[PDB]
């Protein structure tokens, strides 16, 4: 009953992370520049739709960690394997070491995501101020859910063992 | 006839030069300097510009002089009041007056500005010597507590002195009289180190000091990090080549065998290379021009250290010099009165872009606190790893 | 006798409903009351008349044709004149001036600093918004990891491990300490995180208040002399700019040296439009003028200006009648009779202030006010949680 | 013949006056003012001092004038360049020139200096409004905790919220979910109040501001604490008596019915009374003399607010005035050039005792912390009293 | 040829054991080496001779009797002269000056700031000694009263109640809390005492370091112009004070305005005795002189002086021979031959520096060093207490 | 045995307080001025021995508390009654409420003395610095003893009751 609720939240957190890296609405800078992560899209001026890739280039090492979205993509790979691990526990039951594995990956997904947020704010900063777009909070909302999915996975592992 | 040459601060063509024909077409230091000379000399001055656009040097092939120097010897120009360096070979051909201002070769660099705080920038208030002393001391207090006692083991004693320094109340307390002498003394250390940190960090954010990386010519002789050179061929380039003392001989070794060659065609190209590089290239030229460039817009370079050589400008007059005697004496009197210092203060300092310093405390950004965040999440991931293998080995 | 006067602000202005007014009842102001007092003391009936030219008094350099108030006096269309007119060496020769009644000076006029009401949440200024966001995320991630490694095949439950993480950051000790190695190592880093974040907040707020209290406003003319951010300019032409040219003073020679060379035109043509330029800038431009006119501009019209500092120049207004007049005797003594008894001082108090339309350095309650709203809101939820779980059981 | 009068800043007899006989015997503002007048007037000046040592006033009994005014009307003195006030009765007897400087009646007080911190001087950082709000709130949180719970009673709940604000960890912890919402919210309050205190106290000891107790004439009209008066009989004393406006009419009510009478014989006695009283007596005199006394040694008084009345000094000349016309016009020209402002800046400001402000942070003395020591020992003595009667009543 | 020179510091001074020396081997210095270089380039043997008068060169206003180095040249006792002598309009007429070889200027000389070694206990500066005394007395009185009211007809023994009082002040939580009302009330006041004393110490130390870092030394002549605490004076008579009188400059006219009227005599007669007055004051008096003499005074003799700021005045030394001399030609060009190749620059480096007898802003270890001695001493007693109670049982 | 040690310390603390208020050696100020509490005695100058009483006169209230040494004299009266109370327990034994009373007075003596020190330093303070004389530390040493005598008195009261 509660184990079935875990699968829905796993796919939900997997979705919101996939929408985040897809949509180009993470930041605004000045006319209006609705830039995401990989492609900077301009609006209100000469070219209205004509977009192009980002030209990025101790200080050298952080640049390549931003240029390649290494942490947030890893978070999704940990997350989708997590939901797969719960489905692997449904069939061939009574293993007593199935959902435990998934629980660690969901916690690791958030701990991978939380770095990706810190790196992005560190890279952006070097007078009109920047504002955070809707698709950024999608990454913020996904962290909270995955953490809640993580603790749920621990409760089921305790129940079967005891 | 008064022969001069077009410079940046000395001879400037005024705005609406077509509207005003005569001596109103130009304005500068060298124009007013000629009027001060003709105040005690009975001569009629006419602002005539040399057509060549050259100071004066005898060519290797032709063996003939050009420009203001060429017009003097061949007999065309009467008087020459212009920024002209007084060298050995010039004295052989034409007579020179006494120096009216002194100059030399100096160092210029881009303004120091403000640095970006990267990672572990929060360990700035205290020296690197103190941090390591706290690490060693904490082991000593933990080890002594165990030996004093003989519950408190090696692992349990280390935790007590960690929780003590972080200033959080645990359930671990030494019950021995000997142990309570150790505990109370270690507590007083914790109280002063925390209070001293907070005080020194407050001083950093009240007044900010931007200090120069290089001080002297001997400083950039040892540092050997920032590139430095001169013009492709000039007066300062010829000075570097033939040097007796070892400090400039080691500098010419760098200047010659540079990868790539640090030489620019024009003096205007040298200034542009310093600002664009941003603390990567340092240019060497006359201290006179350097001080003028610093005062002009938009102010992003400054003079550093003393001068290396000592040269001077004078008033040039053709060979024989029938009218060169009185004007030489007149300048020496105007030097004493303080008219040369008054005129140099008018064009350099008075007419400038940047002159009040008002500081405003800004909110702390995440980039300067980023260091402690990496330590947190890094420590969390390590705790999961140790807990897993502790269970894995206990299972078998 | 006939009175020659000029219309300018509170000295002389036409009465309300001037269509239904005849004679001296058609005008009202300061000089109106002055003309009434002297005419009684000397003893002659008068008739008020406005000037033809509308100028103060200036002679053309070519033809000596005096235009304004003094021009009407030279040939003699009116007997005497009562108008705000300064005394000069040039004016003293052609027209005979009496003893001064009101003293004037050149003063400074800046935009009035608005009552800076502190933000209801002006206590979260030291740390930026994106930091406060990442402290919340970290707090969640720390407790979840602590919960996991604590109980493994334990007092640190999902409720208790969440309570431990708050107590550490708030610096309020602890109830139970982690017993295992895995629980201790994650507890030690969270203690190191807390100590730096708190000490950085206190030190930054210390720097914020230290700077804010050691700032001085533009008080004297010496403060103007050593400032480039706040610009200052006078009228295009007058007695103010003419004084600045042949100014043999300490640092007022350097003041005009800056005034001559500016990026935009600092010298304004109109005085009233010049007052608007100070409003538009909002603490970026200052306007120099007479002290008498400056004090009246603060009172009448919307309040966004004030006088600051002492008077710089020395100049006095007077009452003029052409030389070879027998009216000099009784009038000059009557002016001294008004001043010594205190008739002018009572009258100057009326038209400026009485007829006007304007008017501890500890930590305030408003700066901390925000954190009280957090305290009450928390107790509001606390009552609701007690309401829910009582109906359940 | 040039008649003058001996003053403090105007006419001063120079040192070695026996050695130099003539116009070298004296030096001041009024001496140079006469030389500026005779620059545009064909007259021979001789520094002659009036023998009476009086300005000029017609006696009630004799009905005859004295001093410089008496010498003018009876025909002895030719010209009078001295600090002489231009009033109504003087204009009837002798003709006066145009004013060369303007003055008025102003307020002077002893320098504010630094105050002694007595007891409870440590509650300075925060307002008295905030302190009482913390007291009320602490009861509210304690009472709500008890009602939320229904071990925690009335006495036990009050202790928890006291130990919470002092930031010491006890053994009392709310176990209810509802109580842990109360606890954590009360904790965040404690963290900000302590941090805000420490920051504001640091600002007080970095830069110290000594602010004046009185600002204007209407300020000491309401305050009515510090004594204020004038000379026994003079120009400013006669001004106070006959007043139309209510603010000075209320001031003359105080000045007349003073206990005791606040009037001194000489102006020198008035300055001495202000410095000795130390913020207890405020003297009222001319703004001219007041500004000179502030600049002179050892600097312990300053001018405050604006002037009340507007008077001026001029050059006096006998009745008829055949030579009074040209010198009246000459002063008006020298007023425009800025020679009067230049000369006043030389004797007042240039020649002075006190002009760099360097501040140094001193160690804290026991007197400024004394407040918290009385509270400690007072609280200890109270604890012994309650413990005794708690045992005494339990015994019976 | 014969050389006329004057004896003054490193230019010309007699050689060691001058009794056993004959001719040019009787002298040694800078000008000695200069005389050797030019005599070879031009081509003539020389004989060094000291001046008769012992002055630089000045003419009496009555009789034109030139006394010093230039006086010996006018009638012609010697051929040429090599001495540190400045060029003037007055000197240029009677004697012919050559091109300058060394440039001089007027600079500032102050007492060298001594290496301020911090006190080994310079961390107990914020609070005075009599406060630290009364904290110890209070600590005893608090525990004794707590001990009394706690146990009365209890965990708070005489040993445990003493341990509770330390843990409260050090801000390290508590093991056991007072249970009774009498024990709680005395515990609450000791908590209120602790919070104020600690917060007052941190805030005072914050103010102590903030002030100490925002102080600037006397760098430029502008810093001298706006200072009254640190006095500055020149020689009684010379070319320095004569320049100051007819100084038409920015703020050097105000500098001499202060110099004229001083309490003691700021003008010193002797230059060497004037250097002693700077030593005696110790950062209270400054002495203005030539830059060349200032740099040499730092090197030779005990080190308690230094040059600070840039050069103010422009003046140059020269080599003089009377007008109508055929020696002007080869010498003037030889001077330019020495300077351009770099003979003077190598020689000036030798006699000043080579022949000389002198030569991060975080919290230092020395400032905290004292509190480490308290840590070790405590562990020393801790070992002794373990040594005593082991022999007993 | 330990009760006999209490009497010696009671008379010792009583003595040191009496010597303190007797001898005029509490402070030095500049030639040399060896001032005590009631009489300011001068040395090294014109008058060498000729001494005179002190001319003293919210701020008004502290002045009279210094002028009359109200606290340190009270401390001695509490102390000498304490030692008397111990002697009153020697004869007519087994009362079970004798030394208890004395113990409170010794604690009260120190808590009275500690005020007298704070008041004296507050009054003195308003460049050569003041130095504390030997007879001041006599008052400091007496506080420590009386506190030790106080705690000893409690131990005897516990022993007889139990
Ligand atoms: C450790 C757990 C404690 C974490 C508790 C976090 C504190 C709450 C933060 C913001 C309240 C929302 C404020 C919204 C009201 C708008 C006005 C405002 O306060 O603006 C914020 C801005 O940063 C300044 O102006
Ligand atoms: C709560 C219990 C903790 C109380 C612990 C008190 C700390 C020890 C005080 C002084 C050490 C003696 C220092 C003597 C050495 C002489 C040099 C010195 O430190 O001088 C002191 C002066 O105040 C500055 O210079
Ligand atoms: N513009 S520059 O960078 O500073 C500069 C560079 C190189 C040679 C210069 C020179 C200047 N100058 O100051 O205009 C004057 C000058 N006069 C001479 O007689 C000579 O030979 N060379 C020069
Ligand atoms: N309106 S204004 O801005 O203040 C003003 C500006 C400019 C000149 C003024 C003037 C006033 N005034 O006070 O009306 C009076 C006045 N009187 C004279 O005699 C004279 O020459 N110039 C003026
Ligand atoms: N010394 S004082 O305190 O300021 C002063 C006090 C009282 C009357 C004064 C007076 C001065 N004065 O400035 O020397 C000048 C002056 N001139 C007059 O004509 C007159 O009637 N009374 C006075
Ligand atoms: N010894 S000194 O203190 O520095 C010094 C003090 C005063 C005048 C000097 C002088 C020196 N000097 O450098 O030896 C050279 C020099 N040369 C001149 O021609 C002249 O007129 N005056 C001087």
* Interchain contact B/E (3 or more Cβ pairs less than 8 Å): yes
Query: In a mutational test of the pocket of ligand 5, which residue from D6, D57, D69, D85 has the highest number of ligand atoms less than 8 Å from its CB?
Result: D85
Pair A27, A40: CB distance under 8 Å? no
Q: For ligand 4, what atom is nearest to the CA of residue C292?
A: 13
Contacts of D364 (CB under 8 A, 6+ apart): E126, E127, E128, E131, E200, E204
Domain ranges for chain D: 2-103+312-347, 107-113+210-309, 121-207
E interface test, pick of D138, D372, D386 with most E CB neighbours within 10 Å: D372
What residues of chain B lie within 8 A of the CB of C168, using their CB? Answer: 168
One domain, residues E186 and E139? yes
The Cα–Cα gap between C296 and B362 comes to: 40
Cα–Cα nearest to D79, from D46, D102, D57: D46
Residue E96 lies in a domain: yes
Number of H helices, E strands in chain B: 14, 14
CATH tag, F1-162: 1.20.140.150
Cα–Cα nearest to D71, from D84, D80, D59, D62: D80
What are the helix (H) ranges across chain C? 30-42, 69-75, 89-94, 129-150, 160-169, 181-213, 221-225, 239-245, 252-260, 271-281, 291-299, 328-341, 344-349, 369-392
Return the CATH fold of B2-102+312-350.
D-Maltodextrin-Binding Protein; domain 2 (3.40.190)
List the structure tokens of B159. 């935790």
Helix, strand, coil shares, percent, chain C, to 5: 50, 15, 40
- From the options 3.50.50.60, 3.40.640.10, 2.170.130.30, 3.40.190.10, give the CATH code of D2-103+312-347: 3.40.190.10
User: CB atoms < 10 A from the CB of D56, how many?
Assistant: 23
The Cα–Cα gap between D69 and B126 comes to: 78
* D205: nearest CA partner in chain E: E207
What are the helix (H) ranges across chain B? 29-37, 67-73, 88-93, 128-149, 154-165, 177-204, 219-222, 235-241, 246-256, 267-277, 287-295, 324-337, 340-345, 370-395
Q: How many residues does chain B have?
A: 396
User: CB atoms < 10 A from the CB of A140, how many?
Assistant: 16
Measured between alpha carbons, how far is residue D362 from residues D359, E121, E211 in Å? 10, 17, 11
Beta-strand runs (E) in A6-74: 27-28, 32-35, 39-43, 52-53
* Interchain contact F/E (3 or more Cβ pairs less than 8 Å): yes
The Cα–Cα gap between C70 and C89 comes to: 14
Q: Is C206 on the interface with B (CB under 8 A)?
A: yes
Q: Of the candidates E275, E308, E341, which is a domain's last residue? A: E308
Pair E163, E140: CB distance under 8 Å? no
Task: Calculate the CA dihedral of residues C202, C204, C205, C210 and round it to 10 degrees.
Answer: 120
Query: Min CA distance, E300 vs chain C (Å)?
Result: 43
Q: How many residues does chain D have?
A: 396
The Cα–Cα gap between B102 and D311 comes to: 58
Flag if A111 and C141 touch (Cβ within 8 Å): yes
Q: Is C201 on the interface with D (CB under 8 A)?
A: yes
Measured between alpha carbons, how far is residue B113 from residues A123, B299, B300, E34 in Å? 20, 12, 9, 47
Ligand 4 centroid from CA C319, angstroms: 15
User: CB atoms < 10 A from the CB of E233, how many?
Assistant: 19
Q: Is B361 on the interface with A (CB under 8 A)?
A: no
Residue E22 lies in a domain: yes
Cα–Cα nearest to C318, from C7, C69, C46: C69
Pair E292, E30: CB distance under 8 Å? no
Pair D379, E145: CB distance under 8 Å? no
List the structure tokens of F40. 């300011």
The Cα–Cα gap between C35 and C37 comes to: 6
Q: Which domain holds residue C160?
A: 129-214
The DSSP secondary structure of E2-52, one letter per residue, reads EEEE---TTSSEEPSSGGG--GGGGEESHHHHHHHHHHHHHT---EEEE-S
One domain, residues E48 and E36? yes
The experimental method is cryo-EM
Cα–Cα nearest to E205, from E114, E270, E126: E126
The Cα–Cα gap between C60 and E266 comes to: 58
E104: left (phi over 0), alpha (psi -120 to 50) or beta: beta
The highest-level CATH class for domain D107-113+210-309 is alpha beta
Q: Based on the structure, what is the number of domains in chain E? A: 3
What residues of chain F lie within 8 A of the CB of E130, using their CB? Answer: 121
One domain, residues C226 and C287? yes
Which H or E element spans position E369? Answer: helix E369-392
Query: Min CA distance, C231 vs chain A (Å)?
Result: 22
Domain ranges for chain A: 1-162
Intrachain domains D2-103+312-347 and D121-207 with the same fold:
no
Ligand 1 centroid from CA C171, angstroms: 20
Secondary structure class of B218 (helix, strand, coil): coil
The Cα–Cα gap between D351 and C39 comes to: 49
Q: For ligand 5, what atom is nearest to the CA of residue D267?
A: 3
The response to whether residue B291 sits with its C-beta less than 6 Å from ligand 3 reads no
List the structure tokens of D273. 């009374």
User: CB atoms < 10 A from the CB of A50, how many?
Assistant: 8
Q: φ and ψ at E197, to 5 degrees?
A: -65, -45
Cα–Cα nearest to B233, from B210, B204, B267: B267
Which H or E element spans position E198? Answer: helix E181-213
List the structure tokens of A73. 């993509």
Q: Of the candidates E169, E187, E214, which is a domain's last residue? A: E214
Q: Of the candidates E166, E198, E214, which is a domain's last residue? A: E214
CATH number (domain holding residue E89): 3.40.190.10
CATH number (domain holding residue E189): 1.10.287.70
Pair B170, E167: CB distance under 8 Å? no
One domain, residues C142 and C169? yes
Which H or E element spans position A59? Answer: helix A59-67
List the structure tokens of D317. 């000349």
One domain, residues C194 and C278? no
Q: Is D330 on the interface with F (CB under 8 A)?
A: no
C-to-N gaps above 2.5 Å in chain B, after residues: 150, 355
Question: Counting beta carbons within 10 angstroms of the beta carbon of residue C27, is it exposed (0 to 12), middle (13 to 18) or buried (19 or more)?
Answer: buried
- From the options 1.10.3470, 1.10.287, 1.10.20, 2.30.130, give the CATH code of D121-207: 1.10.287
C interface test, pick of B196, B380, B394 with most C CB neighbours within 10 Å: B380
Measured between alpha carbons, how far is residue D272 from residues D262, D267, D301, F58, F144 in Å? 13, 9, 11, 28, 52
The Cα–Cα gap between C202 and B201 comes to: 9
Half-sphere CA count of C341, side-chain side, radius 13 A = 10
The Cα–Cα gap between C134 and A140 comes to: 10
Query: In a mutational test of the pocket of ligand 2, which residue from E119, E120, E121 has the highest number of ligand atoms less than 8 Å from its CB?
Result: E121
Ligand 5 centroid from CA D55, angstroms: 8
Secondary structure class of C306 (helix, strand, coil): strand
DSSP annotation of C24: G
CA E47 vs. chain centroid, Å, equals 42
List the C285-290 sheet strands across, edge first: C231-233, C285-290, C106-111, C305-308
Bond prior to C35 in cis (omega within 30° of 0): no
Contacts of F63 (CB under 8 A, 6+ apart): F56, F57, F123
Q: Pick from E173, E206, E210: which is nearest to C173 by CB?
A: E173
Cα–Cα nearest to C12, from C85, C70, C64: C85
Return the CATH fold of B106-114+211-309.
D-Maltodextrin-Binding Protein; domain 2 (3.40.190)
């Amino acid at each position: 009953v509660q184990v079935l609720l875990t699968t829905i939240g796993a796919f939900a957190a997997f979705g919101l992370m996939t929408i985040a890296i897809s949509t180009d609405y993470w930041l605004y800078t000045r006319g209006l520049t609705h830039s995401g992560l990989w492609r900077i899209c301009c609006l209100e001026g000469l070219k209205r739709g004509v977009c192009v890739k980002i030209n990025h280039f101790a200080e050298y090492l952080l640049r390549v960690v931003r240029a390649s979205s290494i942490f947030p993509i890893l978070s999704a790979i940990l997350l989708l394997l997590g939901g797969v691990c719960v489905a692997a526990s449904r069939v061939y039951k009574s293993k007593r070491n199935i959902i435990l594995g998934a629980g660690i990956l969901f916690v690791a997904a958030g701990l991978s995501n939380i770095i990706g947020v810190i790196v992005y704010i560190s890279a952006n900063a070097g007078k009109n101020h920047y504002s955070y777009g809707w698709s950024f909070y999608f990454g913020g909302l996904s962290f909270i859910l995955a953490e809640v999915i993580g603790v749920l996975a621990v409760n089921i592992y305790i129940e079967r063992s005891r | 006839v008064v022969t001069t040459i077009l410079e940046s601060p000395y001879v400037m063509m005024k705005k609406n030069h077509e509207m005003l024909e005569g001596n109103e077409r130009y304005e500068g230091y060298c124009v007013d300097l000629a009027a001060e000379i003709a105040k005690h000399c009975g001569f009629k001055y006419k602002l005539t510009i040399v057509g060549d656009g050259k100071y004066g040097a005898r060519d290797a092939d032709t063996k003939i002089w050009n420009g203001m120097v060429g017009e003097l010897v061949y007999g065309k120009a009467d008087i020459a009041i212009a920024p002209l360096t007084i060298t050995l070979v010039r004295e052989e051909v034409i007579d020179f007056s006494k120096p009216f201002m002194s100059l030399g070769i100096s160092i210029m660099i881009k303004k120091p500005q403000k640095s970006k705080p990267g990672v572990f920038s929060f360990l700035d208030p205290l020296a690197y010597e103190i941090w390591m002393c706290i690490v060693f001391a904490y082991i000593g207090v933990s080890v002594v507590l165990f030996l004093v006692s003989r519950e408190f083991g090696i692992f349990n004693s280390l935790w007590f002195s960690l929780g003590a320094f972080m200033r959080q109340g645990c359930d671990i307390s030494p019950r021995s009289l000997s142990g309570r002498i150790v505990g109370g003394v270690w507590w007083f250390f914790t109280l002063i180190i925390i209070s001293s940190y907070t005080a020194n960090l407050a001083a950093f954010l009240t007044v900010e000091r931007m200090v120069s990386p290089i001080e002297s010519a001997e400083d950039l002789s040892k540092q050997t990090e920032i590139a430095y050179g001169t013009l492709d061929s000039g007066s300062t380039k010829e000075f570097f080549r033939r040097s007796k003392i070892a400090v400039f001989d080691k500098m010419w070794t760098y200047m010659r065998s540079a990868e790539p060659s640090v030489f620019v065609r024009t003096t205007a190209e040298g200034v542009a290379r310093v600002r664009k590089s941003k603390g990567k290239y340092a240019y060497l030229l006359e201290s006179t021009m350097n001080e003028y460039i610093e005062q002009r817009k938009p102010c992003d370079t400054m003079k550093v250290g003393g001068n290396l050589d000592s040269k001077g400008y004078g008033i040039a007059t053709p060979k024989g010099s029938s009218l060169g005697t009185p004007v030489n004496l007149a300048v020496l009197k105007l030097s004493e009165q303080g008219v040369l210092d008054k005129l140099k203060n008018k064009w350099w300092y008075d007419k400038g872009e940047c002159g009040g310093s008002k500081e405003k405390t800004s909110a702390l950004s995440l980039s300067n606190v980023a260091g402690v965040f990496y330590i947190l999440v890094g420590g969390l991931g390590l705790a999961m790893l140790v807990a897993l293998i502790e269970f894995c080995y206990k299972s078998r | 006798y006939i009175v020659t006067t000029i219309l300018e602000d509170p000295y002389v202005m036409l009465k309300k409903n001037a269509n239904q007014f005849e004679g001296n009842d058609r005008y009202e102001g300061y000089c109106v009351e002055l003309a009434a007092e002297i005419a009684k003391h000397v003893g002659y009936s008068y008739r008020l008349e406005i000037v033809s030219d509308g100028k103060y008094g200036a002679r053309d350099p070519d033809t000596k044709a005096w235009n304004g108030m003094v021009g009407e006096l030279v040939y003699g269309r009116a007997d005497v004149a009562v108008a705000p007119l300064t005394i000069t060496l040039v004016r003293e020769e052609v027209i005979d001036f009496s003893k001064p009644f009101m003293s004037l000076g050149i003063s400074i006029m800046i935009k009035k600093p608005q009552k800076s009401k502190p933000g209801v949440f002006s206590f979260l200024d030291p740390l930026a918004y994106e930091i406060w966001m990442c402290i919340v995320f970290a707090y969640i991630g720390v407790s979840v990891v602590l919960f996991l490694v604590s109980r493994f095949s334990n007092e640190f439950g999902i409720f208790n491990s969440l309570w431990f993480s708050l107590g550490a950051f708030m610096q309020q000790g602890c109830d139970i300490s982690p017993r295992s190695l895995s629980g201790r190592i994650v507890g030690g880093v969270w203690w190191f995180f807390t100590l730096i974040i708190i000490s950085s907040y206190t030190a930054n707020l210390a720097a914020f208040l230290t700077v804010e209290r050691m700032v001085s406003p533009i008080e004297s003319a010496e403060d103007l002399a050593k400032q480039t951010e706040i610009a200052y300019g006078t009228l295009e032409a007058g007695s103010t700019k003419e004084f600045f040219r042949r100014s043999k003073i300490a640092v007022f020679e350097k003041m005009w040296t800056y005034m001559k060379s500016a990026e935009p035109s600092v010298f304004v043509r109109t005085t009233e439009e010049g007052m608007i330029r100070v409003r538009k800038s909002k603490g970026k431009y200052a306007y120099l003028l007479e002290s008498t006119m400056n004090e009246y501009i603060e009172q009448r019209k919307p309040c966004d200006t004030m006088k600051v500092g002492g008077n710089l120049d020395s100049k006095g207004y007077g009452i003029a009648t052409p030389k070879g007049s027998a009216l000099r005797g009784p009038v000059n003594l009557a002016v001294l009779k008004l001043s010594e008894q205190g008739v002018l001082d009572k009258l100057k108090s009326k038209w400026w202030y009485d007829k006007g339309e304007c008017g501890t350095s500890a930590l305030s309650l408003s700066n901390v006010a925000g954190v009280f709203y957090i305290l009450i809101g928390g107790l509001g939820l606390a009552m609701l949680v007690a309401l829910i779980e009582f109906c359940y059981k």
